[PDB]
């Protein structure tokens, strides 16, 4: 059974950078190796086959090298559309096996998020539940801190976060945070605030609303 390994789990690289992604086989695979690109929400694409042969329609910046056990996928000058998870596959012996994948992120300039707060809709309140939504729009890097404050009291355990995959157009991320509490608990308080901490902000930004 041939074991395939990719030493880099994930990395960030700037547009124009030379990117090297390695693959190691547990035994000689006699150049029977192919490289695949998995972009978020898109079908997997073949880039390179038989170690170095370029698949039709793939740009020349993608190249493959190697022999025996050690193989490398090179991106000569990284483009913003190149963010994806890259997988190697051996075809030397059954069962066919893949490397664990290398997730490549586009490193771009720091961008502060645009913050928006959404009160629970009147339609939702009619069901005994209240969801307060905080949106962090188009920011970089991915790391962001969201703190929920209810009547100046910091909340814990009653919120859930979701982050989008890197944006194809501007290389940013977006974040949605939902504060969950009963309608009875929602009517007890007045001030609902979302506090955002991010590298792009000189000081944390707070977005709030008054229930009435």
């Amino acid at each position: 059974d041939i074991q395939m390994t990719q030493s880099t789990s994930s990395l960030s690289a700037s547009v124009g950078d030379r990117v090297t992604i390695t693959c190691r086989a547990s035994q000689d695979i006699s150049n029977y190796l192919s490289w695949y690109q998995q972009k978020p929400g898109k079908a997997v694409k073949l880039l390179i086959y038989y170690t170095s042969k370029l698949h039709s329609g793939v740009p020349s910046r993608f190249s493959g090298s190697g022999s025996g056990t050690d193989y490398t996928l090179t991106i000569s000058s990284l483009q913003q559309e190149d963010f994806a998870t890259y997988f190697c596959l051996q075809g030397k012996m059954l069962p066919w096996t893949f490397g664990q994948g290398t997730k490549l992120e586009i490193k771009r300039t720091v961008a502060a998020p645009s913050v928006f707060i959404f009160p629970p809709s009147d339609e939702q309140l009619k069901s005994g539940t209240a969801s307060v939504v905080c949106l962090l729009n188009n920011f970089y890097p991915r790391e962001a801190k969201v703190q929920w404050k209810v009547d100046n009291a910091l909340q814990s355990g009653n919120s859930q976060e979701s982050v989008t995959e890197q944006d194809s157009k501007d290389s940013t991320y977006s974040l949605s945070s939902t504060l969950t509490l009963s309608k009875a608990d929602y009517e007890k308080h007045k001030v609902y605030a979302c506090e955002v901490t991010h590298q792009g902000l000189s000081s944390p930004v707070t977005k709030s609303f008054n229930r009435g």
């Binding site: 073949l46 729009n137 979701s162 989008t164 949605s176």
Partner: protein, 220 residues
């Protein structure tokens, strides 16, 4: 030119048999050297090869799924099927089909995949609520609005804006599993504040597993 599309039941109970189909065009599986394979990907994990079938009917299987896989083909219907017996939560994944010509396989074309959730939990449609744009978002700037798609099972839910006419500035967030065992997600869009206003914004929600459809008008 070549197109491949996977189809499945979406939700299967533990111990039952999972049936998957790969429907294709642009090539024939009767062409000498042709083959079709099945690959799966559990959430946040890598790719795992499952099975393969050649034009001559020769079958190949991954021994990690020992005695549970059956790959078959119907060349006259341009279809390849995969049957997985005695499924468990460990079989919850996106299932992909891919094609190749000659040995070893260079998987030249792949389908978009089909999500399979292995659970005893019942199907439930979501409630859809508007995320109304604020009275003071940015006067003569940018305003944000959206829809909350709450309390559904299983994944996925389809979300579009103005029947696909609005794509720019849209962010449909990956679903979060709540403590109730039901999913919840938000889909947002940033638009100019001057159009709030004069342009209609409708989120089109379609939860195919339950056939629950909701189109919500989002107004200030």
């Amino acid at each position: 030119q070549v197109q491949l599309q996977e189809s499945g039941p979406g939700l299967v109970k533990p111990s039952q048999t999972l049936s998957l189909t790969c429907s294709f065009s642009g090539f024939s599986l009767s062409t000498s050297g042709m083959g079709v394979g099945w690959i799966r990907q559990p959430s946040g994990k890598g790719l795992e090869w499952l099975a393969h079938i050649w034009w001559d009917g020769d079958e190949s299987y991954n021994p990690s799924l020992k005695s549970r896989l059956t790959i078959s083909k119907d060349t006259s219907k341009n279809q390849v099927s995969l049957k997985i017996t005695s499924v468990t939560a460990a079989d919850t994944a996106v299932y992909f089909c891919a094609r190749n010509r000659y040995d070893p396989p260079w998987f030249v074309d792949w389908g978009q995949g089909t999500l399979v959730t292995v659970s005893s939990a019942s199907t439930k449609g979501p409630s859809v609520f508007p995320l109304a744009p604020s009275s003071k978002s940015t006067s003569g700037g940018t305003a944000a609005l959206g829809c909350l798609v709450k309390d559904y099972f299983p994944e996925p839910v389809t979300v579009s804006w103005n029947s696909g006419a609005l794509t720019s500035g849209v962010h449909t967030f990956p679903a979060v599993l709540q403590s109730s065992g039901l999913y919840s997600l938000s889909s947002v869009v940033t638009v100019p504040s001057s159009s709030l206003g004069t342009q209609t914004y409708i989120c089109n929600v379609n939860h195919k597993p339950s056939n629950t459809k909701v189109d919500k008008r989002v107004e200030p």
